Design an enzyme around this catalytic site. Structure first.
Site, PDB file in Angstrom:
ATOM      1  N   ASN A 524       0.613  -1.330  -0.111  1.00  0.00           N
ATOM      2  CA  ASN A 524       0.007  -0.210  -0.023  1.00  0.00           C
ATOM      3  C   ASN A 524       0.816   1.286  -0.046  1.00  0.00           C
ATOM      4  O   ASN A 524       0.399   2.257  -0.594  1.00  0.00           O
ATOM      5  CB  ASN A 524      -1.168   0.089   1.191  1.00  0.00           C
ATOM      6  CG  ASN A 524      -2.088  -0.993   1.097  1.00  0.00           C
ATOM      7  OD1 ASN A 524      -2.962  -1.137   0.214  1.00  0.00           O
ATOM      8  ND2 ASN A 524      -1.843  -2.158   1.920  1.00  0.00           N
ATOM      9  N   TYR A 525       2.007   1.448   0.470  1.00  0.00           N
ATOM     10  CA  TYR A 525       2.603   2.583   0.545  1.00  0.00           C
ATOM     11  C   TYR A 525       3.985   2.898  -0.192  1.00  0.00           C
ATOM     12  O   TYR A 525       4.149   4.122  -0.557  1.00  0.00           O
ATOM     13  CB  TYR A 525       3.025   3.078   2.089  1.00  0.00           C
ATOM     14  CG  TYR A 525       2.107   3.078   3.088  1.00  0.00           C
ATOM     15  CD1 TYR A 525       1.658   2.129   4.027  1.00  0.00           C
ATOM     16  CD2 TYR A 525       1.192   4.481   3.069  1.00  0.00           C
ATOM     17  CE1 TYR A 525       0.524   2.149   4.514  1.00  0.00           C
ATOM     18  CE2 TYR A 525       0.021   4.428   3.816  1.00  0.00           C
ATOM     19  CZ  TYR A 525      -0.218   3.391   4.440  1.00  0.00           C
ATOM     20  OH  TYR A 525      -1.403   3.616   5.391  1.00  0.00           O
ATOM     21  N   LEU A 526       4.582   1.641  -0.698  1.00  0.00           N
ATOM     22  CA  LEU A 526       5.754   1.986  -1.638  1.00  0.00           C
ATOM     23  C   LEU A 526       5.322   1.766  -3.235  1.00  0.00           C
ATOM     24  O   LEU A 526       4.550   0.903  -3.497  1.00  0.00           O
ATOM     25  CB  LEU A 526       6.766   1.010  -1.228  1.00  0.00           C
ATOM     26  CG  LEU A 526       6.976   0.901   0.348  1.00  0.00           C
ATOM     27  CD1 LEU A 526       7.887  -0.436   0.706  1.00  0.00           C
ATOM     28  CD2 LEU A 526       7.883   2.089   0.505  1.00  0.00           C
TER      29      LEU A 526
END
Ligand SMILES: O=C(O)CCCn1c2c(c3ccccc3c1=O)C(=O)c1ccccc1-2
Length: 567
Positions: A524-526
């Site tokens: 989800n973040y990278l």
DNA sequence: AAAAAGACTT
DNA sequence: GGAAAAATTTTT
DNA sequence: AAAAATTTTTCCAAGTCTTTTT
């Protein structure tokens, strides 16, 4: 036949419109309740009694959870019982006055005996059910959206059970209630064949809303919110939105210095409102905290974000740790996970938090005059599409990129580079506060992985003994002739060198993922392009990082952006 | 507005 | 998702 | 084999930001 669609090379749809065509076979309802057999008894105050189907079903759920700690909690037992009585007949309501006289010690054993016979089936009765779940995926797990067949994520509705949630939830124990077709709203195209409702039922309504992503929708009785059945991450609808998330994060990098200098001067502002907004935005940037939305009291567990922090969550220290101006954080965030961090802040930030905590009671809001709406409307006036959530994606991806350059050694092998990748991916979890990967089995299994490394250390030592024998026999029985033995046993040491530097590397990798969770950050973040740009640079195969479903999700990254990609 | 809904991420 | 479960696959 | 370590399904919520109502 192998096709592989490249949705990224196509054109985007103009504002609002998500699709033009949509067809699906609807959701899959949980199999109807099978009542308990004759020999399974329920006892109330010692006396025997058989409960009706709607009230027995709610009893089974409690009996299955009985091993747990939560079934002794007062709020759980209050809630459960309110919802149990509701599902009872008038006879049962009159007899059953309290949960305490109810004996479930015979139902909790049947479901434990039904588990033993479920995991010990025959080869023909296990392959029969493996083909029953496979035909469901084939007929309900796919849908057609705009000339292409895409996979669905949650095609089956969740069976009824008892609510639990995370943390000290005020609604734990409440009945999750069975979802019938009369609660289901179907979304599809006008020209598409509308799914036929399960025999004897009808849908709530059939709508053609091309402004939305969902195929099926209903309402959950616990919170009152709407639940959806959308497509899996491998699709265009979900993948396009995922690409635009990282593209907005790239446009932040180009304005991050201008934003950092403006809020640093905003600490010295004349308005108290502009100070809080800047200090909030400082913690969102430095510590990677969530925006902090305002949630209703008693509807969810007491958790906070940034704008929701109270005077009891921060403790100010002028000294401590040897460093000056330390702000000691101690609160519960999303999913009720504890955030504890003693971090040194700047001169003006400390003397600002003292002004915000002044003559306020411990339950008062630290950031009064501030909510998520103000902070986000301020950020939108700084850059287009900017929200506090972006600062999390940015601070994650830029950290992965720079840590991939700092931690990767060029002269190393491929398995040692994955260890360096996982060290960089560790730094992102030690920022976003993602924790715990199965520490209960990780005590015995680690000490039993160590005895398999020592078993291959002996083989390398026995190889170095055989090469030392060949280096000593190449002198007394001449070179050229009987020197080809010193050649093949020098390649045997090399085959065993990197085989050990794989096992010992997978040991250091597993030992460092104790209270760290690589998952949520990895998916989800990278930005996946940063990884694909590292894999194509150092010749590390993509499958040795991303698995099948991750490679399936990130197909837009694997095709686009080469080794020369900079975030 | 500003609560409440709704529509997605995490 | 993260953890527990079930499904495989690899160790003994 | 038969056990054990792995890998893959399976169980289940809660944040964020936008858009509609009030
Ligand atoms: O398995 C499925 O097909 C549903 C996936 C939805 N889904 C769910 C959760 C989740 C948590 C973190 C990232 C993605 C998801 C996600 O994508 C989660 O914590 C949860 C609880 C109950 C029901 C569903 C979810």
């Amino acid at each position: 036949e192998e096709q592989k669609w490249k949705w990224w090379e196509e054109e985007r749809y103009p504002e609002g419109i998500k699709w033009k065509f949509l067809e699906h076979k609807g959701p899959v309802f949980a199999p109807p309740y099978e009542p308990l057999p004759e020999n399974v008894k329920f006892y109330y105050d010692g006396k025997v009694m058989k409960l009706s189907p709607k009230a027995e079903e709610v009893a089974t759920f409690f009996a299955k959870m009985l091993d747990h700690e939560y079934t002794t909690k007062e709020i759980f037992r209050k809630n459960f019982f309110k919802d149990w009585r509701k599902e009872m007949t008038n006879e049962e309501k009159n007899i059953i006055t309290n949960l305490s006289k109810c004996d479930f010690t015979q139902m909790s054993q049947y479901f434990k005996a039904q588990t033993e016979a479920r995991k010990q089936m025959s080869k023909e009765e296990k392959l029969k059910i493996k083909e029953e779940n496979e035909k469901l995926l084939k007929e309900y797990g796919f849908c057609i959206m705009d000339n292409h067949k895409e996979r669905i994520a949650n095609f089956k509705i969740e069976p009824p059970g008892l609510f639990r949630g995370r943390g000290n939830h005020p609604k734990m124990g409440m009945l999750k209630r069975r979802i019938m077709p009369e609660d289901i709203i179907i979304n599809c195209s006008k020209d598409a064949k509308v799914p036929s409702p399960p025999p004897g039922h009808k849908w709530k309504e059939v709508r053609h809303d091309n402004k939305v992503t969902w195929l099926v929708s209903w309402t959950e009785n616990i919170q009152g919110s709407i639940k959806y059945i959308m497509l899996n991450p491998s699709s265009r609808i979900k993948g396009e939105k995922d690409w635009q998330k990282y593209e907005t994060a790239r446009r932040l990098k180009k304005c991050v210095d201008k934003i950092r200098n403006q809020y640093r001067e905003d600490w010295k502002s004349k308005e108290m409102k502009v100070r809080q907004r800047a200090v909030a935005l400082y913690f969102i940037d430095k510590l990677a905290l969530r925006a902090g939305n305002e949630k209703e009291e008693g509807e969810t567990a007491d958790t906070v974000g940034c704008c929701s922090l109270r005077v009891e969550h921060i403790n100010l220290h002028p000294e401590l740790d040897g460093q000056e101006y330390v702000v000691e954080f101690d609160f519960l965030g999303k999913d009720s996970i504890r955030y504890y961090n003693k971090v040194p802040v700047e001169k003006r930030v400390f003397k600002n938090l003292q002004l915000f905590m002044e003559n306020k009671q411990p339950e008062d809001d630290l950031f009064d005059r501030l909510n998520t709406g103000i902070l986000n409307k301020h950020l939108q006036d700084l850059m287009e599409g900017l929200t506090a959530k972006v600062f999390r994606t940015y601070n994650a991806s830029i950290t992965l990129q720079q840590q991939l350059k700092e931690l990767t050694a060029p002269d190393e092998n491929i398995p040692a580079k994955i260890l360096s990748y996982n060290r960089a991916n560790r730094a992102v979890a030690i920022l976003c506060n993602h924790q715990r990967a199965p520490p209960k089995t990780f005590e015995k299994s680690m000490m039993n992985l160590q005895t398999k490394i020592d078993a291959k250390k002996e083989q390398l030592a026995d190889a170095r003994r055989d090469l030392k024998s060949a280096k000593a026999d190449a002198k007394v029985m001449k070179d050229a002739k009987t020197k080809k033995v010193v050649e093949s046993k020098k390649k045997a040491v090399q085959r065993l060198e990197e085989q050990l530097m794989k096992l010992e590397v997978q040991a250091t990798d597993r030992e460092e993922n104790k209270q760290i969770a690589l998952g949520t950050s990895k998916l989800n973040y990278l930005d996946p392009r940063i990884t694909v740009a590292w894999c194509k640079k150092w010749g590390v195969p993509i499958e040795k990082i991303y698995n099948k479903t991750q490679r399936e999700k990130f197909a837009w990254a694997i095709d686009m952006a080469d080794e020369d990609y900079e975030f």
